């Protein structure tokens with residue numbers, strides 16, 4: 001029932017994600033010199049360094065907010081991909097499955113802790 005435990009759990013999950021080779025295209029903002037039309041398709045860029053910095057600044061109130069930004073990294077990849085078979089997109093799908101598998105308990109524990117707090 002620790003309402004704050006999600007933050008360190010998210011830090012550790014981000015550390016695992018940065019160790020995954022599949023995260024390399026998503027560690028820093030998409031390079032506009034490499035993909036000049038990126039902002040014509042993507043309205044809100046997102047990347048794992050921005051997520052980590054937001055968490056470390058104390059600018060996430062809950063793990064749901066962190067989860068919304070990580071999911072935005074994946075939806076941007078899906079919206080920008082020219083093919084569902086592209087390399088970078090395929091890496092996003094695996095990393096998404098790994099992230100979803102690990103964030104589930106973080107979200108569950110936080111929501112349960114919060115319900116206990118408001119019981």
Ligand SMILES: COc1cccc(C(=O)O)c1
Nearest residue numbers: 030077080081086088089
């Ligand atoms: C820069 O982000 C992305 C996302 C998805 C696919 C690609 C690509 O070039 O195949 C690039």
